[model samples]
Target: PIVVHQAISPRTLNAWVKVVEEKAFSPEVIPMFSALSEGATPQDLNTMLNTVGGHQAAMQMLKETINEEAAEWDRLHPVHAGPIAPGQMREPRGSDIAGTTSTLQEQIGWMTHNPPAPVGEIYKRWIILGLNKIVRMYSPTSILDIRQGPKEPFRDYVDRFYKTLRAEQASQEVKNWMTETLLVQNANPDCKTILKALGPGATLEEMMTACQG
Candidate 1:
């Protein structure tokens, strides 16, 4: 069995709150694959890997990082990154440059296209171009478009909405509006009746709980 223990260190807690409030991969907690060069010493690699508690912890962090990165990527790209459609995506290249996706014709065009220097240069260039595309596709209105599809459950919709809202850093007013809209849409007749009778200072969360029950 594995034992879990910790010392309540202020420095550690500070780093944690940063991840929670910012809702992004804690760059401090995770090493930057881009920063490592061909010249990176073995000691550097060891130190970077050691920050994670172990294989289990590292795997969790990797999942969180990918989710955060995907959200960041999708915020700008209307294509959105869900199970069904990933929009335009890239394979992580362990640097600012990454493997990317495009239409088949574009891929074929690049087969003999304006080639660059070395393999590394090619990776860098493609990633730069993809980033440019991401910039153009960026759209914050996507958050407002979120809805509980017929096949999607209430909890799933809640998860989706909150993630996008955080990724876009939505304003309080937008959050309230969306929350109310979702609550109204999902609430059953009984839930709606309860909501209508709720006292002053009732919150969206309170209404959501009533509906869920």
Candidate 2:
């Protein structure tokens, strides 16, 4: 059923709703917004709605042609802010604040609050970059005073990048404008992957590699 709170009288009606939610190629049109957001060219995506045998065949063929990566090329781009990236020098958290709160919790919260609707990587990028902003806001004395060190705590490489950003800081409504513009939301070039490798003996470099290839 189209209504989320409603119960379906027919199983076929319920099945139809599931397919729409998942966005499989059915007889009806593909939502134009979804197609554009996924990086589809306007001219090509329009062919989805022509309702002729030609259009139907074309969509199915393209769907079959894609491999897993190709299917989600929108989510696969790298997220880097100049040379300043994540994972380069992220340190471990204190024992007291170990499990509940940290960058990961912040990342997950932002992502869960803003999950990508059409199944793309932009959501991941949104979460990571959003979490980066949170870290920047909270981690340092000048910012939020959530210190990793009473001294300078952030990684040297990332610190340099953040320094450059701070030097050029302005009160613009948007932040990390360069990154936001890239439309590469799923790109996590930070070591969060391995620092967060969780379990025994994980390193920042391992996390960095996980986000990369």
Candidate 3:
């Protein structure tokens, strides 16, 4: 039997949050992987892995990278059996190397064409997606759920709510509307009155100014 425990520290969690926010496989994630490789116990590693998506997505990303690279390489380094005539073209090195379908048959065909190693690059991207997925799991499901506390100051509440809003998956339009509405709805009576007077066309900055006064 394996004992499950809290394995992610605040520092690691913050690093992952940065990765998710950036939506890129930057150098920041390399240290996290190295730390996990060096120090994580089997149970800890397994728990972390459980939160990420399956290997299929990673494999797909890798295959696509390989296929793209092969096509580009083939285009650049065309093979010719003999000196080309004025109207003739060189032949591609490998069969079905230019195939772009997702079917197993196509993938098998692409496997025959050897491209340079992109394993490191693909691995970094896979790790970023996995870490981003984990971070998103903790994001607020609804903007409405982030309400002001009874004793919380308006500025503090706005800061907290804005942070939560930033992590949400909603569109920019939806977020804009939600930000305005929530700020007005949760503000003090005086602030609400001021915001209401600004009317629907007012921007977020205007609404914030009215609320702050």
Q: What would the TM-scores of all predictions be?
A: 0.29, 0.17, 0.41
Error of 2 at 70 (Å): 3.4
lDDT of 1 by residue, 138-210 (tens): 4343666666665554566667666666544456897777665654554445544676677435775775575
lDDT of each: 0.42, 0.32, 0.50
Of the candidates shown, which would achieve the greatest TM-score relative to the real structure? 3
| lDDT measured at residue 54 in model 1 versus the true structure, 0 to 100 | 35
Task: For candidate 2, write residues 1-213 as lDDT tens digits.
Answer: 111112223443344345434543322222322432232212212222222233344434433333222324424533344553453322212210111223433323322333312222333233223323433433333322212222332354334443444423244444355323321222233433334444334344543344343
Per-model C-alpha RMSD: 17.6, 25.0, 13.1
Best by lDDT: 3
lDDT of 3 by residue, 1-213 (tens): 011223457565455445534543333444565454333332333334344444455435544554555556668867656886663323433222322222223332223225522222323343444544544444545567766665655677677677777666667999888865786786666666777899888876677666664
lDDT of 2: 0.32
Off by over 4 Å in 3: 1-123, 140-142, 149-151
* Residue pair clashes in candidate 2: 86-190, 86-191, 87-190, 87-191, 125-185, 125-186, 193-207, 194-197, 194-207
